[PDB]
Amino acid sequence: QPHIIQLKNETTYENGQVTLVCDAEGEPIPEITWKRAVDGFTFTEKSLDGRIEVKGQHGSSSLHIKDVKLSDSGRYDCEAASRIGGHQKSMYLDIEYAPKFISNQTIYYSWEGNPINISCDVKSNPPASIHWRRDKLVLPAKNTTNLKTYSTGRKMILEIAPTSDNDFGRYNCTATNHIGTRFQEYILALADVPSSPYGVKIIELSQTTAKVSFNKPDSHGGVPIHHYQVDVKEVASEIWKIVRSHGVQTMVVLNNLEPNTTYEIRVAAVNGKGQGDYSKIEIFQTLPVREPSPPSIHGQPSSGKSFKLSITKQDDGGAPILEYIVKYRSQWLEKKVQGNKDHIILEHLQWTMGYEVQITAANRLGYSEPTVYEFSMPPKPN
Numbered sequence: 001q002p003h004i005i006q007l008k009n010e011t012t013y014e015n016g017q018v019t020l021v022c023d024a025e026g027e028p029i030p031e032i033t034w035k036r037a038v039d040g041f042t043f044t045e046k047s048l049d050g051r052i053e054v055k056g057q058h059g060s061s062s063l064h065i066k067d068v069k070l071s072d073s074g075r076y077d078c079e080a081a082s083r084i085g086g087h088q089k090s091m092y093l094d095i096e097y098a099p100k101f102i103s104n105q106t107i108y109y110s111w112e113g114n115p116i117n118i119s120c121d122v123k124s125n126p127p128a129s130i131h132w133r134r135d136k137l138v139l140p141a142k143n144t145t146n147l148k149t150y151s152t153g154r155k156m157i158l159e160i161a162p163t164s165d166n167d168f169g170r171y172n173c174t175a176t177n178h179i180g181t182r183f184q185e186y187i188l189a190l191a192d193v194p195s196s197p198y199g200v201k202i203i204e205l206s207q208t209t210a211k212v213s214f215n216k217p218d219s220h221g222g223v224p225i226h227h228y229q230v231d232v233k234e235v236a237s238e239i240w241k242i243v244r245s246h247g248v249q250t251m252v253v254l255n256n257l258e259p260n261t262t263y264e265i266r267v268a269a270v271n272g273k274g275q276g277d278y279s280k281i282e283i284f285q286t287l288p289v290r291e292p293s294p295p296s297i298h299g300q301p302s303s304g305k306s307f308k309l310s311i312t313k314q315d316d317g318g319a320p321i322l323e324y325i326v327k328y329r330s331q332w333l334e335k336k337v338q339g340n341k342d343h344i345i346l347e348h349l350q351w352t353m354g355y356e357v358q359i360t361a362a363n364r365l366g367y368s369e370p371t372v373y374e375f376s377m378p379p380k381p382n
């Protein structure tokens, strides 16, 4: 009746090799099978890659792996089976290795007076002891009052309060366990302000507004652009006014400009360190105040032999409409009404007749092009 007497936990190192051994008693002499817990593969007296092979020694088995991978770790099951019965137990293969660094970022940017934390992240088995250093000097040392290190469990942090072109440069994070010492080099670099935005264009223009469009700088200086600043100045003025973009949009709308006015502008990106270089100056001129746009009208019958035109407010042109001029025929007749007006009543018409009408709007600048409108009077009532 098979009974396993020895099946010990094993430890080995990555890329090394290991031997798992199951010892079992019993009459008749027990047969022995290995199963790998993870994928449930079974082994007895292969395999493909040829890394793993099993050899038996009458009442005892051994499973040998060469070139151990981290995926070899975990539980392995030994079953000793015969005609009369079976016994099964389990063991664990632990795999050790020199520390590995899994930090996704090794270059960091800051500037004088701006505190920054650099993080070192390490997987290792057994757990490593970890230190930050510069040329074999562990940090902070007593003579580096601007440095501090923290451990959070899964990270080792070096906090730098930069205050000298000496706080910038390379730092080593070094980790060691009994397999060995490994290290990862980090860089703290001096951030800069952004370079010039370019390809600046006025891509929309009106009387009192304009939208400026541009390309982002080829250099953000090492820390992300936060927003953009557009300076805008009347050529005839000495005072620049400031417009901050909405976030990182490469387009800014200028509001409240004066009509028919020549403006100069320039754009600069701002990052955490400060304001970047200005683009080349760009010039544009806002549209002029003009005459009103052509009026828009429609009508309905108004008793008795009259008709009422209603005004659907239209583009002012920058100066108040103070006068509508309705001329109608079907030779012509004129008629004027005031800007604040809502409608116009034409009177003394004939039944069943059709009329030709032209409407003009006027402001301090002049008259619009006339709007043509025609209508048919209804038949006579009884």
Ligand SMILES: *[C@@H]1O[C@H](CO)[C@@H](O)[C@H](O)[C@H]1NC(C)=O
Pocket (backbone or CB within 6 Å): 009, 091, 092
């Ligand atoms: C084998 O390792 C496991 C951890 O996976 C632990 O229970 C102990 O160290 C060993 N178990 C037995 C039963 O030997």
Ligand SMILES: *[C@@H]1O[C@H](CO)[C@@H](O)[C@H](O)[C@H]1NC(C)=O
Pocket (backbone or CB within 6 Å): 115, 116, 117, 150, 152, 157, 159
């Ligand atoms: C750096 O990390 C430590 C530990 O979490 C934290 O207390 C400290 O405020 C951080 N410093 C900076 C510059 O963010």
Ligand SMILES: *[C@@H]1O[C@H](CO)[C@@H](O)[C@H](O)[C@H]1NC(C)=O
Pocket (backbone or CB within 6 Å): 133, 134, 135, 136, 170, 171, 172, 183, 185
């Ligand atoms: C980090 O360690 C390596 C190996 O000792 C060394 O070449 C390099 O100069 C070190 N960097 C720092 C900042 O000490």
Ligand SMILES: *[C@H]1O[C@H](CO)[C@@H](O)[C@H](O)[C@H]1NC(C)=O
Pocket (backbone or CB within 6 Å): 137, 141, 142, 143, 144
């Ligand atoms: C501390 O910093 C100074 C300045 O570079 C350096 O010369 C000195 O070696 C450091 N002191 C030690 C070894 O702890």
Ligand SMILES: [Ca+2]
Pocket (backbone or CB within 6 Å): 192, 193
């Ligand atoms: Ca620069």
